[PDB]
Amino acid sequence: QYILPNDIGVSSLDCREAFRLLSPTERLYAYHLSRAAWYGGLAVLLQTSPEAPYIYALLSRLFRAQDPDQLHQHALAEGLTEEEYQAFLVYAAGVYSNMGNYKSFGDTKFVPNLPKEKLERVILGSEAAQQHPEEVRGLWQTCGELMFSLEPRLRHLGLGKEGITTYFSGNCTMEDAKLAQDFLDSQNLSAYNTRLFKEVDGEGKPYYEVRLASVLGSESEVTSKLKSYEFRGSPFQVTRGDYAPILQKVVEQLEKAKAYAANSHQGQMLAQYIESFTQGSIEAHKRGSRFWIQDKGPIVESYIGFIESYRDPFGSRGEFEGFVAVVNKAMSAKFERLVASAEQLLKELPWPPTFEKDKFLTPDFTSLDVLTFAGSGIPAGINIPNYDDLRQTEGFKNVSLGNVLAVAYATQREKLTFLEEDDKDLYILWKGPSFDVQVGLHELLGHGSGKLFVQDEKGAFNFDQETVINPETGEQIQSWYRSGETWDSKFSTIASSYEECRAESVGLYLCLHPQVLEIFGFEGADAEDVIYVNWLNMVRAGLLALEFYTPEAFNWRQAHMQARFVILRVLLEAGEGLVTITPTTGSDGRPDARVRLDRSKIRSVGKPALERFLRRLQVLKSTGDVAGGRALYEGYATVTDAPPECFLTLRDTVLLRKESRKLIVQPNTRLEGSDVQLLEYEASAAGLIRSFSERFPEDGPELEEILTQLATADARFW
Ligand SMILES: [Cl-]
Ligand SMILES: [Mg+2]
Numbered sequence: 001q002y003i004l005p006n007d008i009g010v011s012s013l014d015c016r017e018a019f020r021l022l023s024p025t026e027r028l029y030a031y032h033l034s035r036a037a038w039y040g041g042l043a044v045l046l047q048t049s050p051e052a053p054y055i056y057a058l059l060s061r062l063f064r065a066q067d068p069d070q071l072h073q074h075a076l077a078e079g080l081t082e083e084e085y086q087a088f089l090v091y092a093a094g095v096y097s098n099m100g101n102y103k104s105f106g107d108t109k110f111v112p113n114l115p116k117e118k119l120e121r122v123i124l125g126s127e128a129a130q131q132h133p134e135e136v137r138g139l140w141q142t143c144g145e146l147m148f149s150l151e152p153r154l155r156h157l158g159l160g161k162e163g164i165t166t167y168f169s170g171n172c173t174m175e176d177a178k179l180a181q182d183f184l185d186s187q188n189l190s191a192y193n194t195r196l197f198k199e200v201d202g203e204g205k206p207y208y209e210v211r212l213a214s215v216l217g218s219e220s221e222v223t224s225k226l227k228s229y230e231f232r233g234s235p236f237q238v239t240r241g242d243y244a245p246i247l248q249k250v251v252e253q254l255e256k257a258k259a260y261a262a263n264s265h266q267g268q269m270l271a272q273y274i275e276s277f278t279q280g281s282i283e284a285h286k287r288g289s290r291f292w293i294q295d296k297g298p299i300v301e302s303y304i305g306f307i308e309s310y311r312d313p314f315g316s317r318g319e320f321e322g323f324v325a326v327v328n329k330a331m332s333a334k335f336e337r338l339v340a341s342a343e344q345l346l347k348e349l350p351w352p353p354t355f356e357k358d359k360f361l362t363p364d365f366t367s368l369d370v371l372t373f374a375g376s377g378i379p380a381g382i383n384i385p386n387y388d389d390l391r392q393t394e395g396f397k398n399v400s401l402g403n404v405l406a407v408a409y410a411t412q413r414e415k416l417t418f419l420e421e422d423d424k425d426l427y428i429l430w431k432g433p434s435f436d437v438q439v440g441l442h443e444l445l446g447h448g449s450g451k452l453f454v455q456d457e458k459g460a461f462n463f464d465q466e467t468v469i470n471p472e473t474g475e476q477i478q479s480w481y482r483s484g485e486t487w488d489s490k491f492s493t494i495a496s497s498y499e500e501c502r503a504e505s506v507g508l509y510l511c512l513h514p515q516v517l518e519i520f521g522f523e524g525a526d527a528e529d530v531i532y533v534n535w536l537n538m539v540r541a542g543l544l545a546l547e548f549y550t551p552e553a554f555n556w557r558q559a560h561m562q563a564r565f566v567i568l569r570v571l572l573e574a575g576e577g578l579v580t581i582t583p584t585t586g587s588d589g590r591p592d593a594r595v596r597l598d599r600s601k602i603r604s605v606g607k608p609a610l611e612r613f614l615r616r617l618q619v620l621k622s623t624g625d626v627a628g629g630r631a632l633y634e635g636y637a638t639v640t641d642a643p644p645e646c647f648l649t650l651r652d653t654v655l656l657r658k659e660s661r662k663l664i665v666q667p668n669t670r671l672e673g674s675d676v677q678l679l680e681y682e683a684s685a686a687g688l689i690r691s692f693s694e695r696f697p698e699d700g701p702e703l704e705e706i707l708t709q710l711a712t713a714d715a716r717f718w
């Protein structure tokens with residue numbers, strides 16, 4: 001928990017196809033924006049812990065002088081076991097992936113899982129230490145103890161004795177934080193790009209400094225605010241120049257990116273971000289963010305700045321982040337073909353044509369492949385900007401990061417819990433393709449299908465009530481939505497889960513259709529394997545979903561998980577040997593389970609089960625039959641310890657065999673003349689390290705010197 005396990009999962013982001021299909025101009029745009037993002041992500045070290053910048057500098061020197069493979073021999077010569085050496089690599093990979101020594105998931109410190117005395121032998125005997133003996137000794141003295149310290153006040157991000165933070169000086173309390181917020185509010189000044197430093201005089205009187213992040217120092221709209229203030233008896237000073245040499249690098253790259261931008265919204269947003277990072281102006285960043293919202297469906301999508309305020313103990317200061325995510329043009333093309341045949345494909349669905357929408361509208365779904373996501377962590381989706389005023393007047397972007405979602409489940413053979421040995425190789429090979437098919441169907445044909453029957457305030461219907469027949473009754477429709485009731489309002493508790501279930505089930509049902517598979521590029525045995533793995537993944541995910549059921553509250557904590565479990569329950573109810581979940585004894589003697597899906601019964605048993613289930617789901621949804629809908633859905637979503645599945649017992653097994661969150665390796669891009677190439681790394685701790693070793697080829701040592709200088713300037717505050 002305060003360590004990352006030696007066997008931590010690792011996945012590499014796949015942006016290969018998408019990047020290949022970028023034009024030369026879009027490649028150069030993505031190249032410079034990626035450089036901007038990776039440069040800026042370095043500031044996150046300063047925004048994490050006093051020691052983080054030095055740890056980064058030290059690890060970076062170490063791995064530059066010796067590859068993880070060259071250091072390996074050195075480590076063994078110093079008497080580290082293979083496991084101790086792996087513990088170091090995992091630790092370094094963790095620092096790099098979090099931009100600091102605190103997990104971005106949980107905000108808890110992590111330390112190396114090996115004796116400090118052994119690590120010291122490796123560091124001080126390294127080639128880096130041979131090249132710069134005083135500097136490496138100095139870095140180790142500076143960060144060695146803190147690298148390992150689990151003093152209670154350092155275990156978590158926070159204030160005082162409860163935690164550590166570099167958003168504020170070490171002497172700050174929540175009272176200080178609130179006072180600063182009141183001051184900033186009074187001056188209409190955003191906290192997002194700020195830190196708070198408190199000096200205390202001989203009499204214990206506090207003096208406050210609000211420091212803005214900017215290239216420019218304290219030697220536009222910002223200029224007038226850089227001065228002294230008195231606020232409720234407290235002196236306040238507003239200054240700027242935080243992270244200046246890092247932001248200078250960011251700005252250089254944003255300026256270069258402008259040459260390759262796709263439209264004037266992109267050109268203007270980048271000019272505004274440059275002003276923001278140069279002057280320290282959130283007002284400028286908001287203007288840029290407005291332009292960004294106006295830039296609809298760009299091929300190369302990006303955002304950059306002090307965006308999220310989760311890690312500030314007070315919750316108002318942003319952590320730096322930057323991303324570049326791209327439209328996969330091949331996937332766009334496939335989706336367009338799916339949409340072009342939507343009329344025909346919809347007719348295959350198990351409800352009557354009268355229960356279908358009068359005309360097909362492509363749902364508002366956007367998926368992009370991440371090329372770069374810099375900072376402390378990579379989310380599987382984005383929903384931004386966070387500026388409430390802008391969200392209301394202009395809107396926001398809500399986008400899936402498809403290649404990050406694609407590695408949500410296990411991507412390594414040895415991590416495939418609950419699968420039979422003979423399914424493991426297939427699963428690893430066909431997982432990616434099956435995901436692409438499932439997503440496209442789910443989002444487009446799943447959420448894009450089905451009509452609600454509505455009676456309005458005048459008594460008028462949106463369907464032909466004289467002639468539409470409920471296939472379950474053989475009679476005219478007698479149940480419908482009234483009083484402006486909606487799906488969400490009528491089916492309060494289950495609306496979201498039931499709809500995801502219906503959409504996921506459309507995915508499984510339509511992935512059987514040879515025309516769908518042909519669009520996605522699959523025929524023959526390969527198409528059969530894509531089908532099988534899609535279904536296998538779904539049933540395994542329904543077992544795994546039990547983590548998100550709370551037995552004591554008889555309550556499901558996550559809509560999507562509940563939906564997956566329901567699908568499992570539908571396929572189990574079908575019987576005939578299609579799917580079984582059996583509690584077993586693991587190879588280690590502890591409780592385990594086996595998911596067995598008979599591929600030969602998917603069409604003959606699975607298809608008709610989903611036919612019946614989907615027909616029921618839609619009829620009950622269309623007619624707004626909440627009592628019927630609740631009975632059906634809550635029935636399947638019920639978790640009991642009944643044999644032979646013993647799902648409550650299995651939930652414990654699921655939690656037992658649960659492993660920590662995986663690390664994600666990201667690619668690099670390299671410029672040669674006007675050509676940009678993609679560099680990829682192995683999915684391992686060594687691979688992730690190498691990805692960072694190669695990330696700053698022009699100026700890595702300059703950046704490390706910048707980081708340690710900035711850290712040293714502020715060291716007295718902690
Ligand atoms: Cl009815
Ligand atoms: Mg503290």
Ligand SMILES: [Mg+2]
Pocket residue numbers: 014369402403406432
């Ligand atoms: Mg992909």
Ligand SMILES: [Zn+2]
Pocket residue numbers: 442443447500503
């Ligand atoms: Zn959905």
